[PDB]
Swiss-Prot record:
Subunit record text: Part of a complex comprised of PTPRA, BCAR1, BCAR3 (via SH2 domain) and SRC; the formation of the complex is dependent on integrin mediated-tyrosine phosphorylation of PTPRA. Interacts with DDEF1/ASAP1; via the SH3 domain. Interacts with CCPG1. Identified in a complex containing FGFR4, NCAM1, CDH2, PLCG1, FRS2, SRC, SHC1, GAP43 and CTTN. Interacts with ERBB2, STAT1 and PNN. Interacts with DDR1, DDR2 and DAB2. Interacts with CDCP1, TGFB1I1 and TOM1L2. Interacts with the cytoplasmic domain of MUC1, phosphorylates it and increases binding of MUC1 with beta-catenin. (Microbial infection) Interacts with HEV ORF3 protein; via the SH3 domain.
Domain notes: The SH2 and SH3 domains are important for the intramolecular and intermolecular interactions that regulate catalytic activity, localization, and substrate recruitment.
Role summary: Non-receptor protein tyrosine kinase which is activated following engagement of many different classes of cellular receptors including immune response receptors, integrins and other adhesion receptors, receptor protein tyrosine kinases, G protein-coupled receptors as well as cytokine receptors. Participates in signaling pathways that control a diverse spectrum of biological activities including gene transcription, immune response, cell adhesion, cell cycle progression, apoptosis, migration, and transformation.
Tissue expression from the record: Expressed ubiquitously. Expressed in the skin (at protein level). Platelets, neurons and osteoclasts express 5-fold to 200-fold higher levels than most other tissues.
Protein family (similarity comment): Belongs to the protein kinase superfamily. Tyr protein kinase family. SRC subfamily.
Subcellular localization(s) per the UniProt record: Cell membrane; Mitochondrion inner membrane; Nucleus; Cytoplasm, Cytoskeleton
Domain SH2: 7-104
Record protein name field: Proto-oncogene tyrosine-protein kinase Src
Post-translational modification as stated in the protein's UniProt record: The phosphorylated form is termed pp60c-src.
Reported disease: SRC kinase activity has been shown to be increased in several tumor tissues and tumor cell lines such as colon carcinoma cells.
Remaining remarks: May be involved in blister formation in Pemphigus vulgaris, phosphorylated-SRC is abundant at blister sites but not in normally adherent tissue, which corresponds with loss and disruption of CDH1 in cells adjacent to blisters. Phosphorylated SRC is increasingly abundant at pre-lesional sites of blister formation and occurs prior to changes in abundance of CDH1 and DSG3.
Annotated source species: Homo sapiens
Organism superkingdom: Eukaryota
Length: 106
């Protein structure tokens, strides 16, 4: 299901997510979800941002999944699925560097 998602890159490193997201063609909010390098059972949402200060850059947010079922970056805002979390952050920037816009091209 999660593996079925085109934005789910699975087991790729933080550096690789950065290589992919640092493409000059990527607008703010370009993103992907991957496994956390060191936190078992956790995912990482990698997102491109851009400003005149830093230019094109990348941020990483940890996504936790409870056995109790919920998915979240902040425990205050949980979802019944990773798909629903992605859909929510595609509408709300909240504390992220930018709302999610486009799936990172390979
Ligand atoms: C996502 O998993 C994440 C969130 C914030 C900052 C960095 C990451 O990417 P990661 O795969 O390097 O970090 C998750 C792992 C490795 C680094 C320390 C935290 C656990």
């Amino acid at each position: 299901s999660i593996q079925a998602e085109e934005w789910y890159f699975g087991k790729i490193t933080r550096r690789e997510s950065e290589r992919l997201l640092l493409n000059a063609e990527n607008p703010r909010g370009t993103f992907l979800v991957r496994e956390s390098e060191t936190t078992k059972g956790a995912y990482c949402l990698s997102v491109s941002d851009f400003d005149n200060a830093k230019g094109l850059n990348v941020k990483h947010y940890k996504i936790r999944k409870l056995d109790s079922g919920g998915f979240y970056i902040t425990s205050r805002t949980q979802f019944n699925s990773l798909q629903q979390l992605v859909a929510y952050y595609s509408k709300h920037a909240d504390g992220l560097c930018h709302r999610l816009t486009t799936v990172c091209p390979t």
